[PDB]
């Protein structure tokens, strides 16, 4: 079975490999670093509580500074980003899962 280029019906088939040092920014992220963060980083309306943050949200300093728990959906039921660090800043959550 073959499908049109860059139009694979599978959306989660993309396996984000180990981050590459030489680029580390022009891979799985925004093409330009002068662009604004996606909508997942912000709150649109008065919610009653988010179950888990999506994997498209970029990682910021406030994630490790605030201390609030963050979790994403993976092969298991859920994965919480325990022991927050500062090395993963400016990267989306999909690059730190290894499905």
């Amino acid at each position: 079975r073959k499908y049109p280029f860059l139009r694979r019906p599978h959306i989660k088939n993309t396996h984000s490999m180990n981050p590459s040092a030489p680029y580390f920014w022009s891979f799985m992220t925004a093409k330009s670093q002068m662009a604004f963060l996606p909508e997942e980083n912000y709150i649109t309306g008065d919610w009653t509580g988010k179950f888990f943050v999506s994997k498209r949200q970029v990682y910021t300093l406030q994630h490790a500074t605030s201390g609030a728990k963050v979790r994403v959906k993976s092969f298991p039921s859920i994965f919480e980003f325990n022991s927050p660090s500062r090395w993963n800043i400016g990267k989306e959550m999909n690059t730190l899962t290894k499905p």
């Binding site: 300093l61 927050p84 660090s85």
Partner: protein
């Protein structure tokens, strides 16, 4: 710098070389110390905001 047009212009000064403990014999990075602990920042948000 990415290796597209300018890569030889990279210098060791850009490399922090202080947030990790490196092998004094080979030169590879052995371990990395914690970074969020007692982090020093003048402004977590851009200065012009608020």
């Amino acid at each position: 710098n990415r290796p597209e047009v300018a890569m030889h212009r990279n210098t060791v000064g850009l490399l922090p070389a202080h947030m990790w403990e490196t092998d004094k014999k080979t030169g590879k990075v052995k371990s990395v110390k914690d970074s969020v602990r007692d982090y020093q920042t003048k402004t977590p948000y851009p200065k012009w905001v608020q």
